[PDB]
Amino acid sequence: MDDIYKAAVEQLTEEQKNEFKAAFDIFVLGAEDGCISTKELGKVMRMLGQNPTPEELQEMIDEVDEGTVDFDEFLVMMVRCMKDDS
Numbered sequence: 001m002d003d004i005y006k007a008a009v010e011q012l013t014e015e016q017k018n019e020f021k022a023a024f025d026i027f028v029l030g031a032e033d034g035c036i037s038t039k040e041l042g043k044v045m046r047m048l049g050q051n052p053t054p055e056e057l058q059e060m061i062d063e064v065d066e067g068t069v070d071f072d073e074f075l076v077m078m079v080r081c082m083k084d085d086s
């Protein structure tokens with residue numbers, strides 16, 4: 001696990017991590033694929049109750065990505081988005 005991320009992910013409970021995994025898993029054929037598309041990224045975040053804007057998703061992809069998102073990248077993007085609630 002990349003150390004920078006390791007600390008973003010420390011904001012999440014084991015229960016949150018499991019929930020987020022369950023949502024993410026809807027959007028991949030896990031028996032052969034580890035990544036969702038950038039199009040699916042907003043869909044999984046919205047499944048989880050987040051509302052990222054289109055320009056935010058691109059900004060996060062630019063800053064977080066290591067057209068695809070794996071599970072740990074997705075966790076970091078969820079942690080970022082959870083901090084913009086009002």
Ligand SMILES: [Ca+2]
Nearest residue numbers: 013015016019
């Ligand atoms: Ca729960």
Ligand SMILES: [Ca+2]
Nearest residue numbers: 018019020022
């Ligand atoms: Ca649930």
Ligand SMILES: [Ca+2]
Nearest residue numbers: 065066068069
């Ligand atoms: Ca990626």
